Structure 1
Amino acid sequence: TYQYNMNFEKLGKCIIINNKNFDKVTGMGVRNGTDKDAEALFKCFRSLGFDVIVYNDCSCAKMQDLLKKASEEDHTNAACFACILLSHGEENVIYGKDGVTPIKDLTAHFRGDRCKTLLEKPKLFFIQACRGTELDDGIQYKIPVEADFLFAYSTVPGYYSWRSPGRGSWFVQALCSILEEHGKDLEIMQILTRVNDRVARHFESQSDDPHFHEKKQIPCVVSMLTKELYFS
């Protein structure tokens, strides 16, 4: 009644796109630690039951195609779909190695009118990537085509997204530990909300620059879901 139906042969497909090294033209640095993120993610989402595949250093055309294909696959025996983007980013756009592409362009392939097999099923996107230059200085019948999506961004619109080259990204470590522990017994919003809490609290940046010292982060969930979602 108030839950998404999970009675399907497979949980669903999980495309993880891991972008580490970029073309010199985009002039964007190597994202160190992103390999830590991907492997940890691969475990969790696999352990949840997703059929996860990891694609490394994709180009924008490559990403668009990856998604479009999956969009055109047959999802009749799937409960849901999940995509995860690890990259450099700006507002509304994510980086391939050869430039940028709008996030909406990657997602819209799964709109109700463009992926019938995934209608009334959750389509989940998790996006760990910078979202702008800002720093949090801290303190003290028919259904709509845009429905059933959920984007969990690593950060709020306009703000930087922090990643340690040694331990991986703040967001990912958090999402992984919570999932490694309650992925099976909590609802998706409960899970993400705790991730919001752990990133907000447990983390604080440290550099030798005063502009980047003791800075903060809060992830941001967008939901057009229409049911509660549990992975079991």
Structure 2
Amino acid sequence: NADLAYILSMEPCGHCLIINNVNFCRESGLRTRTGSNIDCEKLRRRFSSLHFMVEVKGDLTAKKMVLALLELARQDHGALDCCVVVILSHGCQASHLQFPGAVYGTDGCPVSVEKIVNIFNGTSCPSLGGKPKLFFIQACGGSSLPTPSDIFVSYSTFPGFVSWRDPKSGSWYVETLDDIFEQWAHSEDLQSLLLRVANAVSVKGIYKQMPGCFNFLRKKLFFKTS
């Protein structure tokens, strides 16, 4: 209350798009991301519980990924409270100007996180103005309000399967995140959940790459559950 938390009253809570890239063309040389379907199913099932209208889309091209994203922003989120985008794919380690991060489309071409974030800013998507825009990225391999307000990105490149010898048992990250949400999303906010995830991950890999959060929200975000 007192404008300390975003109001998620509406039912459904919002739209959620999951880009699941598994099969890449030969020219790129990017290995098949087998096990990502396990990941996709966990997340689809998850954000569904969080009362979102989840739409999955497999093996998308950089061009097609962008179109799907634009297609989402062209929507009327007017009576909705939040938007969610999840992308599973190989990560691109290009350096950037505004925001870090990129993910490979099936064609081998990258789509920077900065492009993705902006497709959802205030000008491009007035419909979501003042509402929280969440982006979850798992790169396995490879009055007025400010225009960029309410943008929140969780970026993970943590390799590691649930069963360490089996590259097809799924992502230890998604499973850990999914598990933590299942247990605390009912009483803890987004940033609090993600810290539990970040901690769990670090305990699993001392030096290994820890997930980061590019946080530009104005209030806490308590997901709608039960």
- Superposition TM-score, scaled by structure 2 size: 0.88
Equivalent positions of 1:57-136 (< 5 A) are 57-91=59-93, 92-98=101-107, 99-130=109-140
Q: Is the 8 A contact 1:9 1:77 kept in 2?
A: no
Uncovered stretches (5+) of structure 1, i.e. residues with no partner: 133-140, 156-160, 205-213
Give the aligned partner of residue 97 of structure 2.
none
Instruction: Please say if 1:216 is aligned against 2:208.
Output: yes
* Secondary structure, counterpart of 2:123 in structure 1: helix
Give the aligned partner of residue 171 of structure 1.
173
Which of residues 4, 7, 19 is equivalent to 2:6?
Answer: 4
How far, CA to CA, are the matches of 1:15 and 1:197 in structure 2? 27
Uncovered stretches (5+) of structure 2, i.e. residues with no partner: 94-100, 162-166
CA offsets per residue over residues 128-160 of structure 1, 9 Å max, x none?
00588xxxxxxxx211111101000114xxxxx
Q: Is the 8 A contact 2:90 2:140 kept in 1?
A: yes
Give the aligned partner of residue 210 of structure 1.
none
Give the CA deviation at 1:102.
1.6
Q: Is the 8 A contact 2:77 2:128 kept in 1?
A: yes
How far, CA to CA, are the matches of 2:139 and 2:79 in structure 1? 31
Give the aligned partner of residue 98 of structure 2.
none
Give the aligned partner of residue 196 of structure 1.
198
How far, CA to CA, are the matches of 2:151 and 2:57 in structure 1? 22
Instruction: Please say if 1:225 is aligned against 2:217.
Output: yes
Which of residues 145, 150, 153 is equivalent to 1:151?
Answer: 153
Q: Is the 8 A contact 2:87 2:136 kept in 1?
A: yes
Q: Alpha carbon RMSD of aligned pairs, Å?
A: 1.6
Identity %: 36
Give the CA deviation at 1:18.
0.5
* Secondary structure, counterpart of 1:216 in structure 2: coil
Equivalent positions of 1:1-80 (< 5 A) are 1-80=3-82
How far, CA to CA, are the matches of 1:7 and 1:13 in structure 2? 14
Give the CA deviation at 1:9.
3.3
